[model samples]
Target: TSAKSNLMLILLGLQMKEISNSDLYKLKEVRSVVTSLASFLFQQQNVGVMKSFDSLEKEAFRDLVNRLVSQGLIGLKDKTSETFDLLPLKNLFEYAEKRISVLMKLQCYTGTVQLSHVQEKLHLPYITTNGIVDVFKECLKRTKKQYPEVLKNWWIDLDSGILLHLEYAA
Candidate 1:
């Protein structure tokens, strides 16, 4: 019998195999571990909690994070190298940046601007400026203690309203 329209139904009768799901689970686990470590790192330095947790050494915590990441439990990518600098403060900045980018997308604002301008320019229906401000102040406090020499220029400029260039100085 030549390939007919009815023949297509024969091919469809075969049950498809389930897709391999290991990598997907691995990715989710890694993200969870990364989030946990970031929270631990930030909380370790929190003024309210620092007294109880500050005794934890940064190097030790970093080592623990490295171990977890090495086990495919936490990291951005599967490939793990000893050189990955997992700074707690940097991770917070990254988290905040992602939130800002999302806000920007929602507002439809483009180019450099101020927060008020961003709020006004993008016309976003949310008040994220204060939240960002609070997070940054907390970041500054941590930077002041951990990397004092490098905290001078790490700022998101309010002048442009848009998130201006932010970087760690040290």
Candidate 2:
């Protein structure tokens, strides 16, 4: 089977991320996806005592905050969230305002908004992580300078043959 090839392709998707500006828009899309996921996840964790989302616009704004602490919602987890940290919040606020201005009007839940409700209101797809591979590569490409320790360390077995394989990574 092509399991070996699949693994190699997966590695490059997240490793050889040196590919560039055309990717910036991809970054924006990923950021948008992340914000919603974060808000939903945050709402789940903080259901008690959390204030209601006044409207979709408010949800989007609050999502910006959710993205910061709800790290698990991000596909690549903590390390990739650091890439998000580099982008200023004001930038997010700007696009969020402009973007939401272009969309949504709904009655929201009192303390926590349901993911299904947001998806239907905004017409956003329900992400089940299968799609995360696409964005995970973007994160890897943006942070391409840092060699993943998994690449440099643990996988350095199988003797000289494995070392030869790393040439592709370089």
Candidate 3:
């Protein structure tokens, strides 16, 4: 059973990397699976939010997140509803945009928009969407960088509705 579990895990990881660029809708479903599992375990264990995870837990959580993100499961975007239909690359861009929007609200929580607004707009699972947002938020906090500084600035093009700089500035 242990060997079988290990083999399945290995196969799942490879599959995730392979399909990281596949259809966003399917990937979102995958993210839901992972996040739902994690959330359930977290609540049952009475663990606080993941911000305080120890090194081992953090590493495991990161591996899971990478798998989901790369597998095209957990999107970088927050607003699933306002997004375009699930085209491969379009879905990735939408996920990224949602991340940006969520960060914007977090930075200025007093504004008219709240996290729940984005949540409802996206029709996203609270655990999955908010989990992804937390990952991004933690990255910025740990690096002591602002969102725009951490990620590329938003740009608009006639050819593309809204584009973001995907690669970080080294």
Candidate 4:
């Protein structure tokens, strides 16, 4: 009944077999990443991490985001390429405290999860598994430093899971 629902159906499709779970998740992640980044740009904590992005980059990013907002995100269905340009950069190295705590805690609570090659589950080519590994390490490292307890429950070894196994401190 709203642009929000209309957009989701078009962009995410109708939950058919043609769309894999991994692909669906990637879409969801990008949405959160975009929203989170926008929130930071207006908040006081930008100084802690705002400098990581250059001025032109923010304006450029802003323009792309502006288009999506005006067009209701999925309104750019004809221009999907531009929409996807925002994906790869999605949540790259800028994880918030709760996400760092949540994802790490889930990994810890799971105790053990079989490792799978990153892209094998999805056709979307993006920051390599190793590249994602970098973001995760940086996220967890910062969290461990900024707020130890959130991460203290789980010593993250996301980078080490590059092979056929996994582990945690919990």
Candidate 5:
């Protein structure tokens, strides 16, 4: 699902005019690898089951991801590609903090915050806005479970795709 989903987003992201022609070409190359890996995965399992990539498939995916990282199309904090697994909740805390920081910085503005704007700001062109929101919600869930006070006054309105600080002061 991640393969399919990520490829879909990458394809969509390629439509953006902001992407340079060279990067667009590189992303298309990445798309080819993703499609092949996704095809292999789909053939390996039934729907609804979590399937992991085989070694060959992992290598293919890893190579493409590393290529993206090297080209600066994507950023990974991981020291090694071997450690790069795209878990849904991976880096959720960091993402949450970054989002909160953005929201706080924009608190004085009169404009609305869109999920797409946040997606662009986060440089996650290969993730859908809803997907990003889901990650945020997962982050909040874990934070609430581990430290309830951490999100005592923070909430995300998924319907509006906005992060809100309920206890904001005048």
Candidate 6:
């Protein structure tokens, strides 16, 4: 069981890495599988019955497993339905992290950015307006806390559903 589970984890990680660069439709499928596997691993971990992978000797597999474990999504204790609801946003954020960096480079621009603009920019038609707003809201919060200088002029208006960058310097 341990070997099988370990092998599955390694395969899933490999598949995820591969699909990360694939088409958006395919990525949606991979995201679904990832969420399912994460849920299963969470339950298994909670039961205190997960099997160890001491018998596996593949370095690549071991490294992939370690990376996946380090993501810290396997044993999350959030509500199942809530977690499921946010899985798509999480997946979008994961895949779009690099692309988002490009937008981040324009941090000095002060303007009202609508959710529709971001949706089009990322080619993420599947994500809802609410999802986009929520994800960006969280992103703004995290960036402000972790890199306060980067987003000191940025703000999100949930009521109007737009990201604002106050033109304080101009």
Specify the highest-lDDT model's number: 5
Q: Which ten-residue region of model 3 has the weakest summed lDDT?
A: 156-165
Looking at model 4, which ten-residue stretch has the lowest summed lDDT? 110-119
lDDT of 1 by residue, 1-170 (tens): 11111111121222322111233323443344434454566666656555323234333344544443332222332234323222222333445445544533454222243445434433333325543354444444454466545433444555424343434434
Off by over 4 Å in 2: 1-54, 72-136, 143-170
What do the candidate models score in CA lDDT, each in turn?
0.37, 0.31, 0.37, 0.39, 0.48, 0.41
- What lDDT does candidate 5 reach at residue 5? 40
| Global CA lDDT computed for model 1 | 0.37
57-144: candidate 6 lDDT, tens digit per residue? 2222333333333332121123332121223334545533443344567744444555555556655445454554444554555555
**Candidate 2 RMSD to the real structure:** 21.8
TM-score of 5: 0.34
- Consecutive 10-residue window with the lowest summed lDDT within model 2: 159-168
Report residue 68 deviation for candidate 2 (angstroms).
2.7
lDDT tens readout by residue for model 4, 7-93: 233433343423322243345544554444545455634345554344533443445344433422222222433333323223333
Residues 64-110, model 3: lDDT tens digits: 54544443334444343323222322333355445556655454322
Provide backbone clash counts, one per model: 6, 1, 5, 0, 0, 0
Clashing pairs in 3: 27-73, 76-95, 77-95, 78-98, 80-122
The C-alpha stretches of model 3 lying farther than 4 A from their native spots are 1-113, 128-132, 135-170
TM-score of 3: 0.24
Q: What is the lDDT of residue 102 in candidate 1?
A: 53
Which is superior by TM-score, 1 or 5? Answer: 5
Ranking by lDDT: 5, 6, 4, 3, 1, 2
Best by TM-score: 6
lDDT of 2 by residue, 1-170 (tens): 12212222322334332322124224444445435544665566443655543443245434443433232222222343333221222222233333222221221111122334333443334322222222232333333245442222111122211111121122
